[PDB]
Amino acid sequence: TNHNLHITEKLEVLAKAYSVQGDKWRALGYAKAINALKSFHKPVTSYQEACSIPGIGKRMAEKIIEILESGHLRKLDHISESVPVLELFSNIWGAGTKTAQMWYQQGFRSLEDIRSQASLTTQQAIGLKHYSDFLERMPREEATEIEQTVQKAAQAFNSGLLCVACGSYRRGKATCGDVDVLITHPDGRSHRGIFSRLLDSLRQEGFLTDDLVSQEENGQQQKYLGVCRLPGPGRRHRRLDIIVVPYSEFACALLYFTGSAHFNRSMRALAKTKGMSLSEHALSTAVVPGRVLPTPTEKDVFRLLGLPYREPAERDWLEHHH
DNA sequence: CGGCGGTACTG
DNA sequence: CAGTAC
DNA sequence: GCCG
Numbered sequence: 231t232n233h234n235l236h237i238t239e240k241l242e243v244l245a246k247a248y249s250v251q252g253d254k255w256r257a258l259g260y261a262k263a264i265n266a267l268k269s270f271h272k273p274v275t276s277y278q279e280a281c282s283i284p285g286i287g288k289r290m291a292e293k294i295i296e297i298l299e300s301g302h303l304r305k306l307d308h309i310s311e312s313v314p315v316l317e318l319f320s321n322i323w324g325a326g327t328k329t330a331q332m333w334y335q336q337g338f339r340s341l342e343d344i345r346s347q348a349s350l351t352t353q354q355a356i357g358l359k360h361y362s363d364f365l366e367r368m369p370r371e372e373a374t375e376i377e378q379t380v381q382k383a384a385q386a387f388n389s390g391l392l393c394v395a396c397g398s399y400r401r402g403k404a405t406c407g408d409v410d411v412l413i414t415h416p417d418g419r420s421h422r423g424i425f426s427r428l429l430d431s432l433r434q435e436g437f438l439t440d441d442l443v444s445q446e447e448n449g450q451q452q453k454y455l456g457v458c459r460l461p462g463p464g465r466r467h468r469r470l471d472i473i474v475v476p477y478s479e480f481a482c483a484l485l486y487f488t489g490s491a492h493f494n495r496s497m498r499a500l501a502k503t504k505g506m507s508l509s510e511h512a513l514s515t516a517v518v519p520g521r522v523l524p525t526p527t528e529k530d531v532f533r534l535l536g537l538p539y540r541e542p543a544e545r546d547w548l549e550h551h552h
Numbered sequence: 553c554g555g556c557g558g559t560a561c562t563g
Numbered sequence: 564c565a566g567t568a569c
Numbered sequence: 570g571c572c573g
């Protein structure tokens with residue numbers, strides 16, 4: 231299926247390295263080239279053929295060709311030595327390239343240096359203590375029991391509450407990095423004030439163990455990023471994301487929350503090219519705030535952008551099956 | 553050459 | 564506002 | 570990094 235496997239593996243390394251150094255546009259560039267190579271019907275066999283692929287230009291073609299002929303990629307041996315440490319530090323939830331570079335420059339080089347000498351935000355402290363647990367993907371079946379816990383706790387307050395698991399779960403993957411749950415209510419109104427009760431309920435039975443992003447002073451809070459752990463011996467702590475949205479926002483919220491990330495960016499870049507704006511809240515149309523278009527279902531958003539409905543399993547990348 | 557998704561917490 | 568996150 |  232990926233006929234250029236030996237090429238993409240090497241470019242992924244290089245893309246990683248730019249990403250942890252904070253060269254994000256260049257990393258975006260690699261990421262699209264790499265998907266395009268995976269999606270190509272045959273091995274690339276010439277430079278010309280490489281440039282012809284959207285997402286691939288002069289610089290990426292040379293690397294693709296160098297690799298194709300010579301079997302290795304030179305630049306992979308001139309990667310800064312800081313990269314693996316920068317990666318290490320960036321893998322802490324709540325620390326990004328800036329914090330990882332500040333740590334590097336303060337001279338830390340391991341997690342233990344971080345534990346014992348770095349200054350950590352509240353979030354980073356939690357990311358650090360659960361570093362290994364958050365690095366491991368969970369089986370699809372564990373993700374299902376996380377979703378059911380949230381759903382059961384919500385339906386004890388109001389049985390009409392609709393809870394669905396999105397992200398990679400809804401796109402069909404066998405493992406999940408974290409669970410993303412979207413809650414709404416078809417009556418348009420009873421989603422309001424839910425978090426207070428739902429969080430209190432999930433903390434009571436011991437399920438939520440730490441909160442990362444949760445502005446609980448707000449009665450209209452709409453999101454929760456935190457940490458859960460299923461009951462039973464030896465369970466790992468997992469990342470859970472919950473959003474609560476009004477039903478009139480359901481189609482746009484579902485789309486957003488299903489992702490993938492890269493899919494959502496391309497969908498939003500597309501909408502902007504047609505003088506519209508796509509968010510988690512709405513598809514909007516004047517936009518010089520413009521007006522919301524009605525979108526009762528995901529199908530409507532796709533139609534209004536001139537695309538065919540894409541099944542969640544096929545929402546890895548927009549430009550994929552094209 | 554400049555733009556590259558749009559939004560929401562934290563401090 | 565910068566940083567990080569989804 | 571690539572694209573318009």
Ligand SMILES: Nc1ccn([C@@H]2C[C@@H](O)[C@H](COP(=O)(O)OP(=O)(O)OP(=O)(O)O)O2)c(=O)n1
Nearest residue numbers: 397398406407408410486487488489490491494
């Ligand atoms: N930058 C981002 C990140 C995420 N998203 C949307 C919103 C979010 O709900 C959905 C899933 O993102 P996550 O980061 O949870 O990634 P996945 O579920 O695809 O994969 P994994 O958890 O199995 O590793 O994708 C997005 O618009 N923009």
Ligand SMILES: [Ca+2]
Nearest residue numbers: 281283284286
């Ligand atoms: Ca091209």
Ligand SMILES: [Ca+2]
Nearest residue numbers: 320322324325
């Ligand atoms: Ca991080």
Ligand SMILES: [Ca+2]
Nearest residue numbers: 408409410471
């Ligand atoms: Ca997530």
Ligand SMILES: [Ca+2]
Nearest residue numbers: 397398408409
């Ligand atoms: Ca996820």
Ligand SMILES: [Ca+2]
Nearest residue numbers: 443444445446
């Ligand atoms: Ca809080």
Ligand SMILES: [Ca+2]
Nearest residue numbers: 255553554570
């Ligand atoms: Ca440039």
